[PDB]
Assembly symmetry: D2
Homo-oligomer: 108 residues x 4
Amino acid sequence: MFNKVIMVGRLTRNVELKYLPSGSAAATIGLATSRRFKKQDGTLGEEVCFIDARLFGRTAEIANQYLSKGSSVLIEGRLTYESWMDQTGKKNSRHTITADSLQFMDKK
Amino acid sequence: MFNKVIMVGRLTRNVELKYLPSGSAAATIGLATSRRFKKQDGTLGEEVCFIDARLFGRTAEIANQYLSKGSSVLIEGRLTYESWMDQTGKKNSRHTITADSLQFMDKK
Amino acid sequence: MFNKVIMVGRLTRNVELKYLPSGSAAATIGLATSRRFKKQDGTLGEEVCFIDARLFGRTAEIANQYLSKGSSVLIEGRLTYESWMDQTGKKNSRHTITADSLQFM
Amino acid sequence: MFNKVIMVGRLTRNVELKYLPSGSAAATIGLATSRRFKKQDGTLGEEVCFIDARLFGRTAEIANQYLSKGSSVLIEGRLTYESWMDQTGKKNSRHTITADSLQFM
DNA sequence: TTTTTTTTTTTTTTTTTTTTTTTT
DNA sequence: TTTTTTTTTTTTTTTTTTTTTTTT
């Protein structure tokens, strides 16, 4: 089933690069994407979407090398549903974006 | 900032159509989108993304009239970050998709 | 069948706007969007896709009041295959983008 | 500049595959994707966009082994503007889609 | 297949063409 | 601008064309 996400945002923190026990690079970036919209009066408003994106392999390292907090970037990937047991034994779930590619937007 | 979601999925429940105190129609649908992928062995796996989509106005009613539990549909919209205080006074947040359009996929 | 196009490009000429009998606007814009690829035997390349986009209603109006040659815009829409005949009966064809929306940066 | 195309279409002819000097595959497919619009003065209309897509590497191979005239597929890629000259020097142009990926239903 | 927590302009219709070195 | 909780096939390169009535 087709699952596609395309978002332009800026990092809310520096990218955190790690290696998984397996050897694969992994990274998670925090994105903030804002939208403007007119209120039924004439007021202009804003919604800010905060969301984490998962990176793996070469993509994770590319992100760690070229992006930093505040960086602007276009991310392309899929929507992800994470479901797991925390160390307390409590069921927990999460929605993240698993990114396939990044389009750097810092150069102006 | 560009914020786009395009997902094909099936409803996990019947669409729940309501009117907001303002008069606007609103509806929320539960989607399930599954992905298949090969495991580093040769096993084929699956991830299932469960996610809610918000509909408003004519879109909400269109959904309520033509879609039901198990229905296949293509949704196009944006990623949304919901943040609010529950009736207990506790901070709560959520990621949903706010849908702009629906492409029906039940007719075969 | 799903048909989506999302592209960022600069206008290659000014907006051309007319009005239909119904009264709704209809404009056409010329776009240019480039891609860099330092992928080749050795060095860096550049490809530019030139293409026209059809605009309708209030979108065509917004394009007409705010865009001009050189402007950068993001458009969403679908791919369109246009065909017709010459005054000499020679049938012609063409691909364009029919935009649903516009976002200017 | 961002350049995205996502389209579902049926193949209008069989897959045409060759191999480049490097050894990687390169195929071309003809697509047709239709849109319904019961929007007009009164009744229902239908438009079909015909367009060719360029495939490379293993994607071209998968297209060659599993697709044929009539097959339905979802392709992702970008819009491409191709140009060249006649043997008589007449310069030609063309729009195609260069696919990054393929998904067959 | 992979872990586990606030960044910094608007929203069916007709027509028939030549141009504004950050990774991948 | 808007509420508040498990559905049912694979993943820089060259070439130069005519076809497989669910809403919007």
